[PDB]
């Protein structure tokens, strides 16, 4: 390999796309974008495999090129555009609306949304910095770059971004009790409240979380996402409010819904 990679094979693709293993040899390599190649759901898989609104790569390209699909506030035509965690995928043609979010098993949910909540999104700043001419600014996990943010905001706090014009609307500070949404690791999709952090010097920061069932767990800070106050999120939550049931509990729920 003497350059960038431009292919992906289905076994190499991240599992949480739920791509089947015998439908062709290749996978949609999410083109460069605002989110990592992993932890990002391309529009090709989103439309074809989740919504089932189109059966082919050809058909998905038709959807995108007639511009019925717009991610966040902006129309996108990249068949493999890497829609990420907090992305709002609009689909105005059908008057549908979704926000990407993880179910408790660790997969992007099909979580539908209302327009008053599709107009905005949350963002966990990955750093605060000074741009040129002395301009302080922040960048979110989505790469969105916001200038002149509120000076009380620090790293890994949460921004509430308007899709009409990416700008600080308010922020939630990272301290004990704040509702967090665990984005990755073995607890991907969990929701809980911080009880305290470790703050390792040099080492990876760690935070202990307990949820409404007191099913406490521990997760790295590069992996958490505060999205509101105790039991009051800044968005809607997917099915189940991020509660993880045991295998026995899941079997019971399936039997009870039979």
């Amino acid at each position: 390999a003497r350059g960038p990679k431009k292919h992906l094979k289905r076994l190499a693709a991240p599992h949480h796309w739920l791509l089947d293993k015998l439908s062709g040899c290749y996978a949609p390599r999410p083109s460069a974008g605002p989110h990592k190649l992993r932890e990002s759901l391309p529009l090709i898989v989103f439309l074809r495999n989740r919504l089932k609104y189109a059966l082919n790569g050809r058909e998905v390209k038709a959807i995108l090129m007639q511009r019925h699909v717009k991610v966040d506030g902006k129309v996108r035509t990249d068949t493999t555009y890497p829609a990420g965690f907090m992305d709002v995928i609009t689909l105005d043609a059908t008057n549908e609306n979704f926000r990407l979010v993880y179910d408790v098993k660790g997969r992007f949910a099909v979580h539908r949304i209302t327009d008053e909540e599709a107009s905005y999104k949350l963002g966990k700043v990955k750093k605060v910095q000074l741009g040129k001419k002395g301009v302080p600014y922040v960048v979110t996990h989505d790469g969105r770059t916001i200038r002149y943010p509120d000076p009380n905001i620090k790293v890994n706090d949460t921004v509430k971004i308007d899709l009409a014009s990416g700008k600080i609307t308010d922020f939630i500070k990272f301290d004990a009790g704040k509702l967090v949404y665990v984005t990755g690791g073995r607890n991907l999709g969990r929701i809980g409240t911080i009880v305290h952090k470790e703050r390792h010097d040099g080492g990876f920061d760690l935070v202990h979380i307990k949820d409404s069932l007191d099913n406490t767990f521990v997760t790295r800070l590069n992996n958490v996402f505060v999205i509101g106050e105790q039991g009051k999120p800044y968005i809607s939550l997917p099915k189940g409010k991020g509660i993880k049931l045991s295998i026995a509990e899941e079997r019971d729920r399936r039997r009870a819904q039979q």
Binding site: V135, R147, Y148, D150, P151
Partner: protein
């Protein structure tokens, strides 16, 4: 013989190899950056030749038919606006949309003059784009200046509030 072109600049009557490169005659690079070892005959004239390419720099006193006697046209008239202007010796205000060469072409009995399009032509669309550029740049400057002012006031208010907080401190 063997059809090796006589390269310009190479000072010997023999055939020699050259790593011919772009912007040089005798060789056309098939891939960008490519260089190929071609064979070129020297600029010194010799018996080796089969043909000699000559162009007349001063006409003699008698005619050659395939030469000065007859002529062929400049196959294409100018296509850029200022080149039309220089060709016709026009002044500043002379129009060009009607001095374009309406070269005739007849498809059977269907005659028409498909004249060349004119580039670098002054047209209101370009003025629209230029003025749009100006408004865009000034709008951005105004917006950036006003936003900087707002944050400056916000940080100033933060300073005042911290001063009030320290007043609450220290009793």
């Amino acid at each position: 013989k063997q059809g090796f072109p006589m390269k310009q600049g190479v000072l010997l009557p023999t055939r020699i190899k050259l790593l011919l490169t772009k912007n040089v005659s005798c060789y056309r690079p098939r891939r960008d950056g490519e260089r190929k070892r071609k064979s070129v005959r020297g600029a010194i004239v010799g018996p080796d030749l089969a043909v000699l390419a000559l162009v007349i720099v001063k006409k003699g006193e008698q005619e050659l038919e395939g030469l000065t006697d007859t002529t062929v046209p400049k196959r294409l008239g100018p296509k850029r606006a200022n080149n039309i202007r220089k060709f016709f010796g026009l002044s500043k205000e002379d129009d060009v949309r009607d001095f374009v060469i309406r070269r005739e072409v007849t498809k059977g009995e269907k005659t028409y003059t498909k004249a060349p399009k004119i580039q670098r032509l002054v047209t209101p669309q370009r003025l629209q784009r230029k003025r749009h550029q100006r408004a865009l740049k000034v709008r951005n400057a105004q917006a950036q200046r006003e936003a900087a002012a707002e944050y400056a006031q916000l940080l100033a208010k933060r300073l005042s509030e911290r001063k009030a907080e320290k007043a609450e401190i220290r009793k």
